[PDB]
Amino acid sequence: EDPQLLVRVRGGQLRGIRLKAPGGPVSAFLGIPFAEPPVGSRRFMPPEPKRPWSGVLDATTFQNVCYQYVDTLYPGFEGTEMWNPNRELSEDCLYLNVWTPYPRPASPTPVLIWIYGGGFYSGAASLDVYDGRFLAQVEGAVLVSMNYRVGTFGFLALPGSREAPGNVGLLDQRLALQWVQENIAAFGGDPMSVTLFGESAGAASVGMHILSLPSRSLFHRAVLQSGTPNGPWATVSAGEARRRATLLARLVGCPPNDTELIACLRTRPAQDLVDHEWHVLPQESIFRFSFVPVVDGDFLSDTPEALINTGDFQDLQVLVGVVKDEGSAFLVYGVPGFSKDNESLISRAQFLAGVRIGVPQASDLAAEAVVLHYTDWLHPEDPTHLRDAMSAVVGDHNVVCPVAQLAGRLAAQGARVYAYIFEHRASTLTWPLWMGVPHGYEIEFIFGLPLDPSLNYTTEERIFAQRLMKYWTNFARTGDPNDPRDSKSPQWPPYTTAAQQYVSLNLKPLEVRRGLRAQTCAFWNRFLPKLLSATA
Amino acid sequence: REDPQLLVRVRGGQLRGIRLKAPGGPVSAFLGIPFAEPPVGSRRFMPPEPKRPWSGVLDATTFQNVCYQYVDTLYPGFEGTEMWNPNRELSEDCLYLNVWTPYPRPASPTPVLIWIYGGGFYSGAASLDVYDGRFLAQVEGAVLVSMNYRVGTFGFLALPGSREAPGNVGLLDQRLALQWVQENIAAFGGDPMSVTLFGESAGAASVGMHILSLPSRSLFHRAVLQSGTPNGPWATVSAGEARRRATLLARLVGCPPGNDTELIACLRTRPAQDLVDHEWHVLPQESIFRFSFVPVVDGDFLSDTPEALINTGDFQDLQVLVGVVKDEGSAFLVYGVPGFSKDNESLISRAQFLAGVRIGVPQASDLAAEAVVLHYTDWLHPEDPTHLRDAMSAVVGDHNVVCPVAQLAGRLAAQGARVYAYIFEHRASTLTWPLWMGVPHGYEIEFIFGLPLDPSLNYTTEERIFAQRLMKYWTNFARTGDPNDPRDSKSPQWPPYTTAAQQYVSLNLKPLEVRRGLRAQTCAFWNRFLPKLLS
Numbered sequence A: 001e002d003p004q005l006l007v008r009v010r011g012g013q014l015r016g017i018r019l020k021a022p023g024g025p026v027s028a029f030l031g032i033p034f035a036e037p038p039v040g041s042r043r044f045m046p047p048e049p050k051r052p053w054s055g056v057l058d059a060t061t062f063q064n065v066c067y068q069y070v071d072t073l074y075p076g077f078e079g080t081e082m083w084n085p086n087r088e089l090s091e092d093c094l095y096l097n098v099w100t101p102y103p104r105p106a107s108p109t110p111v112l113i114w115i116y117g118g119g120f121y122s123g124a125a126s127l128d129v130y131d132g133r134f135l136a137q138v139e140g141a142v143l144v145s146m147n148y149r150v151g152t153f154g155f156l157a158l159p160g161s162r163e164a165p166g167n168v169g170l171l172d173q174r175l176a177l178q179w180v181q182e183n184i185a186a187f188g189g190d191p192m193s194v195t196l197f198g199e200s201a202g203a204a205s206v207g208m209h210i211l212s213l214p215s216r217s218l219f220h221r222a223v224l225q226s227g228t229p230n231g232p233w234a235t236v237s238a239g240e241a242r243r244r245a246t247l248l249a250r251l252v253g254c255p256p257n258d259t260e261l262i263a264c265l266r267t268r269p270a271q272d273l274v275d276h277e278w279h280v281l282p283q284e285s286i287f288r289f290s291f292v293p294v295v296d297g298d299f300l301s302d303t304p305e306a307l308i309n310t311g312d313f314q315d316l317q318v319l320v321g322v323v324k325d326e327g328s329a330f331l332v333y334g335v336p337g338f339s340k341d342n343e344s345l346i347s348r349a350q351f352l353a354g355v356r357i358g359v360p361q362a363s364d365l366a367a368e369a370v371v372l373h374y375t376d377w378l379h380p381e382d383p384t385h386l387r388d389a390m391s392a393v394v395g396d397h398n399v400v401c402p403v404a405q406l407a408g409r410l411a412a413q414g415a416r417v418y419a420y421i422f423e424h425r426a427s428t429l430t431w432p433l434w435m436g437v438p439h440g441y442e443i444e445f446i447f448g449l450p451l452d453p454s455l456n457y458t459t460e461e462r463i464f465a466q467r468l469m470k471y472w473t474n475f476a477r478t479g480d481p482n483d484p485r486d487s488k489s490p491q492w493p494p495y496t497t498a499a500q501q502y503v504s505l506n507l508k509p510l511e512v513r514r515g516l517r518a519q520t521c522a523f524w525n526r527f528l529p530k531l532l533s534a535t536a
Numbered sequence B: 001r002e003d004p005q006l007l008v009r010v011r012g013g014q015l016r017g018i019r020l021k022a023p024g025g026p027v028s029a030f031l032g033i034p035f036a037e038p039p040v041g042s043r044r045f046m047p048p049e050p051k052r053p054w055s056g057v058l059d060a061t062t063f064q065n066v067c068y069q070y071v072d073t074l075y076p077g078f079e080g081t082e083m084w085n086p087n088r089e090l091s092e093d094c095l096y097l098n099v100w101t102p103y104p105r106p107a108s109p110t111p112v113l114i115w116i117y118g119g120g121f122y123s124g125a126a127s128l129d130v131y132d133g134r135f136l137a138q139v140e141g142a143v144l145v146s147m148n149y150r151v152g153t154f155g156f157l158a159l160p161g162s163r164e165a166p167g168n169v170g171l172l173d174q175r176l177a178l179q180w181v182q183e184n185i186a187a188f189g190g191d192p193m194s195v196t197l198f199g200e201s202a203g204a205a206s207v208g209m210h211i212l213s214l215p216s217r218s219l220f221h222r223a224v225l226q227s228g229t230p231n232g233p234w235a236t237v238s239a240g241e242a243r244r245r246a247t248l249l250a251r252l253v254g255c256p257p258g259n260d261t262e263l264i265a266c267l268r269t270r271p272a273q274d275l276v277d278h279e280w281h282v283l284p285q286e287s288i289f290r291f292s293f294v295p296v297v298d299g300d301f302l303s304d305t306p307e308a309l310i311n312t313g314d315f316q317d318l319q320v321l322v323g324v325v326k327d328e329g330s331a332f333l334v335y336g337v338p339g340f341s342k343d344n345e346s347l348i349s350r351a352q353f354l355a356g357v358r359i360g361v362p363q364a365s366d367l368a369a370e371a372v373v374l375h376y377t378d379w380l381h382p383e384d385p386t387h388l389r390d391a392m393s394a395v396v397g398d399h400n401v402v403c404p405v406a407q408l409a410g411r412l413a414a415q416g417a418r419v420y421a422y423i424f425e426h427r428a429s430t431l432t433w434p435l436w437m438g439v440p441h442g443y444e445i446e447f448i449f450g451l452p453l454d455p456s457l458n459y460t461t462e463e464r465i466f467a468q469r470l471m472k473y474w475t476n477f478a479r480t481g482d483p484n485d486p487r488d489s490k491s492p493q494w495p496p497y498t499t500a501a502q503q504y505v506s507l508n509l510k511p512l513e514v515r516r517g518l519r520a521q522t523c524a525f526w527n528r529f530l531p532k533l534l535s
């Protein structure tokens, strides 16, 4: 028995496993239960703390993936399969993982907590791209990641009911955060320096913890990559979650009031619920997800828009950013004319039609406005332009402009904000060239995977990943991503509403740019709401 | 006796002209030739009638009366304004034209250029210094003709459907002068089978209206439109709106409005200056770049809106040169936008910018104005008073001239026309408007007419060569339908404007540079999105 691999937490003893990182050993504790299995009558319910266990709990393997839809568009293609469950599906999935340095840190170390994405309908903390091994080994970080319930299991809501109050997957995350406060010191983590970070839905989740008072005492800094709590896909109104839950129930034969409806849903096999998950969306669309956090008046006291507009963010530090082609990869999930297996050169007609699908809530006038803005009037019918514009429309509406308004609002209201745009395309990428640097493809680099020589990343990419791991952990450590030794430029400046400085993350040294897609986001954040607003 | 080269006969009767001095040598000039019966008394508001023949030799050595007309007094003594003001007596008796020809008159029939002045349809005169045809005549061998046409109420006050005030009579004055060139210009050595209309601002819009009005089409062969178009927000009005303004003007001088004969009769008894004193008071909103009495869509001269006629017209044979100056809007701003003056830098606040946009785009709803403001804001420096000043100028320039021109070039080119397009980017060294106004509306004319060739005017040597270059493009175009020089291989070429390639040229001190899209992103906002708003 290795004494470094034995830990006592509140609930009992645990045995981890020494894993190999290229620079040396790390201690990993995988599959640690943080809640009572949310099964049977606990489906749709807020999670309860895990009861104490006897003996030594085996924490050497990843635990089950939360029940979710599995992608079937491109079977056995790396670019999709890399996001698919890599363990057994089960409703019994409330476990987290901890990577620490080996030997365990001598003095308390800043803690990073990862929250995965997947549109609140998918994801898992066990995917190879979320491997905490590298960050633990090179930067000496204590890295934590939890599973949280997704799809119906995490977010089906009958608002105001006792037995489907909504947002429970966000409560799973909050419970993992509390678990960290109570327990991370036993691993040599510092519960007094916790940085949340996440991508896509994970980034929106981090956003939600910023916006929810009970979460605030559980972290000190935040990183939101390619996602925000504001914007068109991350939340729904109470009225709208009730409609979808009700509709899903109708779809699976329930009922033959809220209590009855939820009791009958509870009798249904998990796959029955996933079978009809997609059919509750109000419009033909892309970048919209059936079961997401609901504006409940509880976890979320008002809309994320109202909350960001009026919040006090004085002692908060935030790192936010986007990748170069946020919307490209989404296009093949519903826009006629797009495929990964050809160059996807579209007609003008295919563009107008794709806009109604990229901006599913847009009126004729509003979609006309989108079209007229994104057209290159010098080359109005050029298929390459039209394709890139369609991708641009989706990236901007869903990620880049929501990010830009989050950054401005936080900065204006006392927070310390650092922003980036990530522009390096992975040499190993399996999606076609026209998709560029798609949603999700920075993660790989932040987590330090290019340092594994067996993964065939170029030398330049390894150095690049070393730089990114240093920014992220510098940020966790201090709230400032800059290397406090060196001494030479260019320094990453804070983002502000005046100057609007952000940096390009790519193979070249940091470049400072101003204005995060400024004219275009003004279109989305200031004009379009007004459209659309008073009419209709 | 008497210079034998200055005696000519027209339909008409005998004319005596004057030998004038141009820098390169003598030109012939026949100034103040009457082409209509004086449109006075029972004839105010009425279409013009042909001038009745005279006896003896009519003296044609001095400019005749300017049409009666508001005189600018915003900046008294200031050359930037006084250069546009009347330079002869104001009279309703003003329907006269001018002819410049080489001296001695040309051997073989020469291409004719007919100038039509601007001034918002409320002002202008063919006798102004900047419209002097002596240089084009002497240097290019051109026959140049310019006419006075009635402006303001006299030219354009309309009670659509009536006998007594049908509207568009100023346009009809221009047509009559065109008919006169057909019958008579051969007497001066002009070629009636090669007549090119050119004009700037309202002159340009006028030219466009002759293109769109069938009876005018047989009277010219080619057309040049400088900083103006028949389509756009200011060049025309509906029948309903012209009726409203005429009626209101009537009231103000009242003349209590009750059929149309009684009302026009009463308006007819009013003194000219009195109509001018109230002209401005009929505008539906506080505005700039809007004029009270302009061409009306009558279903006669203009069979439908200029927009409908350009969208559906067939322009197979037509050759047009079209263009704009770098700063179309700047000088309009001192005539009504709070915050702007010629005597300071006119740095403005964001509030003053929003307030200006409502005045510059007076027909706009709150939704449309906010669209304008958001489009023109520099979101990186949204409070910068220099940028706000410049945005306000572009808002006015784009809405009133650049985008209506771009729309025009696009439609004509799509429907058979050969179109050539320019942006004029040189600031006269002699300009007296402040530096912030850039190259304002009107300030290419001076160069097209070759004024810099007069050494007494203090232009630079390069300005002299530049004016020479321009006179040469314009008269090549008149001559051949192509502004390019056929012999001159090395000089850069001026390609036609097409929908596919949207090419146009920079006119400045440097050799021609070919650019693409005038000025596509922004004009898509005005011509494609904004109407669809708005509405």
Ligand SMILES: Nc1ccc2c(c1)c(-c1ccccc1)[n+](CCCCCCc1cn(CCNc3c4c(nc5ccccc35)CCCC4)nn1)c1cc(N)ccc21
Pocket (backbone or CB within 6 Å): A069, A071, A073, A079, A080, A083, A117, A118, A119, A121, A199, A200, A274, A277, A278, A287, A289, A290, A329, A330, A332, A333, A334, A438, A439, A440, A441
């Ligand atoms: N016939 C059906 C039945 C059920 C579902 C179906 C289709 C679809 C669907 C599949 C193809 C085309 C249209 C629709 N869908 C739609 C899923 C597709 C939408 C997301 C795809 C996507 C694309 N990207 C950008 C590129 N990178 C990623 C991904 C994926 N996941 C992630 C997760 C985190 C970060 C990045 C990332 C997964 C897919 C591929 C790329 N992110 N997500 C379902 C969804 C449900 N919630 C429930 C059931 C079903």
Ligand SMILES: Nc1ccc2c(c1)c(-c1ccccc1)[n+](CCCCCCc1cn(CCNc3c4c(nc5ccccc35)CCCC4)nn1)c1cc(N)ccc21
Pocket (backbone or CB within 6 Å): B070, B072, B074, B080, B081, B084, B118, B119, B120, B122, B200, B201, B276, B279, B280, B289, B291, B292, B331, B332, B334, B335, B336, B440, B441, B442, B443
């Ligand atoms: N208090 C009064 C009473 C009556 C009139 C008044 C004001 C005004 C006015 C004056 C100052 C400020 C606001 C309003 N106006 C306003 C007219 C002012 C708008 C025209 C000024 C202008 C400015 N530009 C651009 C610069 N270049 C030119 C000009 C002018 N003319 C020309 C003609 C062709 C090409 C260029 C050019 C004349 C003036 C200055 C510059 N073009 N035109 C009136 C108009 C009428 N039709 C009748 C009466 C009155």
Ligand SMILES: *[C@@H]1O[C@H](CO)[C@@H](O)[C@H](O)[C@H]1NC(C)=O
Pocket (backbone or CB within 6 Å): B338, B339, B340, B341, B344, B345, B346, B347, B348
């Ligand atoms: C310029 O003068 C005008 C009118 O006299 C005035 O309203 C404006 O405030 C002045 N602008 C500046 C920058 O001083």
Ligand SMILES: *[C@@H]1O[C@H](CO)[C@@H](O)[C@H](O)[C@H]1NC(C)=O
Pocket (backbone or CB within 6 Å): B456, B457, B458
């Ligand atoms: C031109 O130049 C001279 C200075 O050499 C000046 O005295 C004269 O008045 C000027 N004339 C004009 C029209 O500006």
